[PDB]
Design a protein around this ligand. Sequence first.
Ligand SMILES: CC(=O)N[C@H]1[C@H]([C@H](O)[C@H](O)CO)O[C@@](O)(C(=O)O)C[C@@H]1O
Ligand SMILES: CC(=O)N[C@H]1[C@H]([C@H](O)[C@H](O)CO)O[C@@](O)(C(=O)O)C[C@@H]1O
Length: 586
Amino acid sequence: RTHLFACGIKRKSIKWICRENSEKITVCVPDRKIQLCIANFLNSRLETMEKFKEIFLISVNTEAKLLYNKNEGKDPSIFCNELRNSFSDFRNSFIGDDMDFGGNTDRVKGYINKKFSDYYKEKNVEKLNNIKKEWWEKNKANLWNHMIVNHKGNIAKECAIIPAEEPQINLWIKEWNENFLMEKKRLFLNIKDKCVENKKYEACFGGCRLPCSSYTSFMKKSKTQMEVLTNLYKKKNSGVDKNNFLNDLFKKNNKNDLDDFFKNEKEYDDLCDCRYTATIIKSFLNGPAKNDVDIASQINVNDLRGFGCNYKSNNEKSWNCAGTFTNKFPGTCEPPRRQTLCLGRTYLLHRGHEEDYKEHLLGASIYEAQLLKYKYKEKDENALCSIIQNSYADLADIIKGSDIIKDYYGKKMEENLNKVNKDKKRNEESLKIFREKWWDENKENVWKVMSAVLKNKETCKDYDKFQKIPQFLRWFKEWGDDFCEKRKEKIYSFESFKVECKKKTCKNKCSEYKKWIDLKKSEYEKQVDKYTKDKNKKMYDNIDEVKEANVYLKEKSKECKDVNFDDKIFNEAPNEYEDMCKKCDE
Ligand SMILES: CC(=O)N[C@H]1[C@H]([C@H](O)[C@H](O)CO)O[C@@](O)(C(=O)O)C[C@@H]1O
Ligand SMILES: CC(=O)N[C@H]1[C@H]([C@H](O)[C@H](O)CO)O[C@@](O)(C(=O)O)C[C@@H]1O
């Protein structure tokens, strides 16, 4: 026990630590090497050579015990490999061939070198190295035999044979490989177990996403680690892959080079990619949808409703001018489009993972664009364009947190981005700037996917400059173009109806129109008020082509290009139909 305590219990978890030595050279040492039993050398004065021989026998024999206890419950092949890899480190480290440093690795190295400088009375480093190599050659047999003396019956007969002498890195690359593949299995098994086939959108929930992301971080670490182990082999072998050691190692696993060695297989994406978010996002940013508008328009209902959205109802909702938001922003009217802006539900927002929130926002941005395209599919490109921008701008204000509505799912969008913010300073002005910056980092991508549903993608200009326009102002225009459009429609309805009767209950058609125009009149008044009251407060000083409400509409509202704002416009019946709505006796 006196010897076992000197070393210390081994950590079952297999991990490779990567530091940089005094030569600015990055190296990756296995945890097994770090805990290599070498403390006994320090607890002994090492009086004579025979004493050194004795302590060494204890060092290796003790190493076997702790390794055995370490691998209780594991595959016996591990205990076999670790014995051989540790015995190899006892050699390599003892003959000057070592990458590991710090701690007792150098504290024992220096001591051993010093005692050997006293034993042989030789202080030449190179000479000593040879002396030690010769000593090992003549003591390696007795060391190995004594190392596995109490564990011969716990390893295969083939493992009982003394390990072949090889360079340290040659053995570390081998060991690291077995640890990599072994760990890659376990992790991927948990993926299959939790993701199944990802046909029921398992990859969109923690159950499958967590193990998938755990596998991801493992591949990232593994790659960087092997990149080092790779460079060290080349460097130690004259910058050459001598004996095609690496080239072979790659083909042994059916891979070409490092890059391909970590290239996520098609299988992974099929199980870890939320098919109603990631799959489409990739299609819009890289795949078919990116270029083909027809493909970017085709909607997948299952994925749509899986995300938490639905087709824009054929019906038309009235502009909300009596929401709770009106309390702080009186006069504002929420566009029906905004009332149904696709934000989704999902599990990505909750956790607060930057990439997950990004994956969701893009998902919503896409669906929104698709649904709009499916609704206003019969509108010109110039019109459809401004419609996409209207939502793109709303999204911006929702993220930034400058949205006027602050609806349930609206806040959820903002507040969930605050969860992504791991900063501990959480005041309004602080959380604001954070989101505002985060938007600038992704606003370009958000637009790329949304603009993918337009025949000519570069028809929409100043989409970003449009977002910088105050929300209310953007809506007041949308209301103008809307009202004017539906006005022309209702006028065409009268012309098409008047002639129908002219050849072969006018009060009814009118009555319906009388109630409509009155409703639109109040929506016009509420906004016009806010526009004037806000103008006097000097809120729109930093806005060109703005510094009368009715006038502001004409120029901007392209639809109202042939309409003036008199008192006649809000009459119970059009001027040309004023006398016609009257005399309904006919
Ligand atoms: C200093 C050094 O290089 N190795 C020593 C390690 C490490 O200090 C820590 O385990 C993590 O660094 O700890 C030991 O107590 C142990 O693992 O049994 C002894 C060993 O000699
Ligand atoms: C709350 C919100 O802004 N938009 C949501 C809307 C609104 O709840 C309704 O349209 C009523 O306003 O409903 C959805 O189910 C939908 O349109 O597919 C999801 C969408 O995210």
